[PDB]
Design a protein around this ligand. Structure first.
Ligand SMILES: O=C(O)CCC(=O)C(=O)O
Ligand SMILES: O=C(O)CCC(=O)C(=O)O
Ligand SMILES: [Fe+2]
Ligand SMILES: [Fe+2]
Lengths: 13, 341, 341, 13
């Protein structure tokens, strides 16, 4: 949980 | 209120309108314009903190690069290799190669290829003289192999300003600077990136169509494990309303950036980008920053991008737990069919 | 192969058939019979380890209780309170009260009520003499407040045998023993329990219709946060094939347990249980055991109950993360609509 | 993960 709403860092590169 | 990107701006020195409507492609959806403000305007700062798009007309963010062009860059951009995508159509759908494994039934529409700047300029000069239908798009991160003048110009960017932005917004580090050089008419289909981006226009004009995070159900992104992850499955030129019904409820914010403008593309916001038709080649350098970290206690209800983050994670979890990405859909369907739908 | 529960067994001493077909309710689905084996039969042990139903005809598991009946129990079962569910219809859909919060729009079909055994026997004797349509069902765990003889009888159970089962199957501890006393015709709608169960029949006859874990998509359980969690939404008497299409692909294993029989109901297996029509009251004592723990490295692909476990957990996670159970469906729908379905 | 496929212990009681 809340370890759920965290994101990543992916971009179109 | 569907002004679009607004009326074509008048160029200084009565040099006529920068661009005109006929250079913009046509779409089935309506758009309202993104505010074009001054970096000193309190409203702009307001929009950035609130994570809403805004075109900043006077940052001087990439002032030194405004003199860039094919000859100049070729002249001293370095000897390194430049990633270059080619394609039959005007749409350059980005695909994650490391994920191509999962979907062996995916036929790339655009193919990548390393080469020397001078090579790109040639391949670009050939089609340009032979009137070919092929299209190219240079998308390369700015490394070390960069030329001496380019490194000089790079130092001329307005770091004072952008760095303060990184500090005020609590953003994370600058992950990279992508150099994009495209041919008039080129299109990057709607997708959303997971980082904060300052899109600084250098040469030519680009039309930017953005959509808020809460329009996730209208843009139908590909599955997280699919190569086209984060891209919209909807074909804007020919939207399939049968498969994508909610695409008829889509409303985007639009604008046309020109040399000197910096468009703030908030993290998770969808963006569709096109180089104006018959507008010549375009040059842009973007800045990517990891977003600010999750606050102590997450308030409720959740913001739209948080939900998108959650959905993304659920899909990744099922992908690992099930031991195979393709069983994700079936499990998800078995979960809702006749229970939640 | 759709023998059902098999032909009515012939009672010893030529006392005629124990029961007959007309006492069984009619349903739209087909069933194959559950093996009726001997505790000494290698096949039975085989089925138990493989987690497949099986009726064990000679365990003597609850030998001392075979003499139980209303008078005997009332005579010395204790003074404690006994949970007692009442209902208008013959279907006693179980509902989790602690979850009734989430769905304020749920109207209980069966209401619970504490009382003394002698009270249940009276309320039961009244309807029984006044020919009422009301139905009762005593479902109470066997506590401490138990009478002296009952505690004696309890000691007479075949712990040697059952304990070895708990050891061979690596099961966890015995969580409880539920005492169920129902009226002829009473039905417990299809549901699945999260524990291993040894269902020991004591008085009267019960028809048990079980379904394997892999028939999850045909039984449409209620949402995990709903009070009727783990129960099938499908009304067996009048199946709604529009909402529950896959219920037409349902195939269950059936059998009729009588005094002395023990039905192994594997964890996660769906079961529908009914007291034969005009068969008198029924008495059963079940044994619930936590299943064996998850193995070192989980092999692939997953077993059906593991997937069900996963689905259940995903729903619980979204329930907490979203801060509200009712947003689960919407998020799930937004996730698949036009992406995985 | 696998903290995913683990179960609970709920019965109709
Ligand atoms: O400018 C483009 O064509 C694509 C750029 C983009 O998607 C980005 O910088 O995030
Ligand atoms: O016997 C019944 O009526 C219900 C029993 C049951 O569902 C169980 O013991 O798991
Ligand atoms: Fe992007
Ligand atoms: Fe049960």
């Amino acid at each position: 949980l809340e370890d759920l709403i965290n994101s990543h860092a992916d971009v179109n590169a | 209120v569907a002004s679009g990107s607004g009326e074509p701006r008048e160029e200084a020195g009565a040099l006529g309108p920068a661009w005109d409507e006929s250079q913009l492609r046509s779409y089935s959806f309506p758009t309202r314009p993104i505010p074009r403000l001054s970096q000193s305007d309190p409203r702009a700062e307001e929009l950035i903190e609130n994570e809403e798009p805004v075109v900043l007309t006077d940052t001087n963010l990439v002032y030194p690069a405004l003199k860039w062009d094919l000859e100049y860059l070729q002249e001293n951009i370095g000897n390194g290799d430049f990633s270059v995508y080619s394609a039959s159509t005007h749409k350059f759908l980005y695909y994650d190669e490391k994920k191509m494994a999962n979907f062996q039934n995916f036929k790339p529409r655009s193919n990548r290829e390393e080469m020397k700047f001078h090579e790109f300029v040639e391949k670009l000069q050939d089609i340009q003289q032979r009137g070919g239908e092929e299209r190219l798009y240079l998308q390369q991160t700015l490394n070390d192999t960069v030329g001496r003048k380019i490194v000089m110009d790079f130092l001329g960017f307005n770091w004072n300003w952008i760095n303060k932005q990184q500090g005020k917004r609590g953003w994370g580090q600058l992950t990279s600077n992508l150099l994009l050089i495209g041919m008039e008419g080129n299109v990057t289909p709607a997708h959303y990136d997971e980082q904060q981006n300052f899109f600084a226009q250098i040469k030519g004009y680009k039309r930017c169509i953005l959509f808020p995070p809460d329009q996730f159900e209208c843009l139908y992104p590909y599955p997280v494990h699919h190569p086209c992850d984060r891209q919209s499955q909807v074909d804007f030129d020919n939207p399939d309303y049968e498969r994508f019904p909610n695409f008829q409820n889509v409303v985007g914010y639009e604008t046309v950036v020109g040399p000197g403008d910096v468009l703030y593309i908030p993290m998770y916001w969808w963006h569709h980008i096109e180089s104006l038709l018959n507008g010549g080649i375009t040059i842009t350098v973007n800045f990517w920053y990891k977003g600010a970290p999750t606050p102590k206690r997450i308030e409720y209800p959740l913001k739209a991008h948080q939900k998108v983050a959650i959905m993304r994670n659920i899909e990744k979890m099922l992908g690992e737990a099930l031991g195979n990405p393709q069983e994700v859909g079936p499990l998800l369907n078995t979960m809702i069919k006749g229970r939640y739908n």
